[PDB]
Amino acid sequence: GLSERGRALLLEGGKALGLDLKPHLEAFSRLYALLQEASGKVNLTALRGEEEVVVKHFLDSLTLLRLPLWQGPLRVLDLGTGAGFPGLPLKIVRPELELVLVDATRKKVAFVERAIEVLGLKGARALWGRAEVLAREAGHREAYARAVARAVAPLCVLSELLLPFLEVGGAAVAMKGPRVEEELAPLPPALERLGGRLGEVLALQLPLSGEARHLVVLEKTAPTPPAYPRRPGVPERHPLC
Ligand SMILES: C[S@@+](CC[C@H](N)C(=O)[O-])C[C@H]1O[C@@H](n2cnc3c(N)ncnc32)[C@H](O)[C@@H]1O
First to last CA, the chain: 43
> Can you give the CATH number for the domain in which 19 is found?
3.40.50.150
4 CA → ligand 1 middle, Å: 31
Q: DSSP states of 124-176 as a string?
A: EEEEES-HHHHTTSTTTTT-EEEEEEESS--HHHHHHHHGGGEEEEEEEEEEE
Number of structural domains the chain divides into: 1
Look up the domain containing 80 and give its range: 1-241
Known binding-site positions for S-adenosyl-L-methionine: 80, 85, 103-105, 131-132, 150
The rounded distance, in Å, linking the Cα atoms of 42 and 85 is 20
The strand pairing partners of 76, in sequence order, are 99, 146
Known binding-site positions: 80, 85, 103-105, 131-132, 150
* Alpha-carbon torsion, ordered 220, 152, 37, 51, to 10 deg: -90
Q: Please check whether residue 204 is in contact with residue 215, taking contact to mean a CB–CB distance below 8 angstroms.
A: yes
